[PDB]
């Protein structure tokens, strides 16, 4: 559990279920290499993306596919996706929870970072 | 205009128009006394609530009638209203903008305090 | 667990620990009667406030004592407290998670409502 | 002015001044091509990015240099930058305001889309 993503739906007051999430890591040649992906569960949470060993220092991008979520609810949202870009593990291994609260024309995102 | 209120609708990506706003000031006996009120304009803003002379240091509450706003859109909301409670402090010249971003099950509020 | 409160600190990227929370329920004479209170744990969470039996239909106010939290960190925040006011259980018993994300001049609050 | 960006600082309750903002438009080959850029004004706003003629339908990215903003205040931030990605749609006349509310470990963004 060094990386967990949680997504909530501010319209329904619920977890955002079946939201696709793609994680990327910046490579040596400055491109975004695919790192891990998954979908949020019935709790709005996505666990198991990576391991402590694999989640090395680097610049990571978490891309939450909000448009597809809204569209399947009948809403035409503003954003294509929510993107969260951050340096990880640069002072040693940490645990990151990336949370997103979604509305059709707005989101917020928060990171909780803990040292195990 | 030392106090302005702005209300935005995160479902429709618009100003929140015709929202009732009530301002109170905490009295000596610790009750909330009516101070100012109005309805947001087409821009989601409510100007002209008070004056520099009248807006003395004290504890204020801004109550925003969110429930009625959502009910008029046919959307079931969580909150009865949104409440913003703060102390006004003389600390050189100051203007307060209270912003609220509304979703059915969530709101965020921000205060922007500036000196012209 | 019909009522849980979670508080996060957007400055530190952490749970907001030792935050006082007071819950009130609107009485028959339209006053706010004390209902329950507590403090957030090391996880930022406050569990055990009430029981399914005691948490009847009504209008509830959750008052999160944000000012005192900030002040003990050396920050002079804007708000006195964050207040969350809502009708509960009016279509039968539900479980409510009230979350707050705190910054010195801003907060957001979200409710997750589930039917057990 | 079909596109305006506003950036606010939730730690200090102020406009976020002198923040670099870069706008990109998605090209045919799926890369992000520079489109407009500037730095926020004393009001936290960036006006004059584009024109109605130039701002055709397409996918845009607004990148806000949050990290440099926080570093200048001596505050350690989580994100590399804040990114807002959206489709511009002709649907009668329209003006887009992209707002971002910044905290060290969190941001929220809102789009206000209006027709004069």
UniProtKB/Swiss-Prot annotation, chains A, B, C, D:
For the keyword Signal, the answer is yes
Q: What is the effect of changing residue 24 to V?
A: In AMYLD1; amyloid polyneuropathy
Q: Which effect does the record note for changing residue 36 to T?
A: In AMYLD1; amyloid cardiomyopathy
Quote the tissue specificity entry.
Answer: Detected in serum and cerebrospinal fluid (at protein level). Highly expressed in choroid plexus epithelial cells. Detected in retina pigment epithelium and liver.
* Keywords, ordered alphabetically: Amyloid, Amyloidosis, Cytoplasm, Disease variant, Gamma-carboxyglutamic acid, Glycoprotein, Hormone, Neuropathy, Phosphoprotein, Secreted, Signal, Sulfation, Thyroid hormone, Transport
Single GO cellular component term: protein-containing complex
What is this protein identified as?
Transthyretin
| Source organism of this protein record | Homo sapiens
State the organism's lineage: Eukaryota, Metazoa, Chordata, Craniata, Vertebrata
- Give from-to of the shown chain within the full protein: 30 to 145 of 147
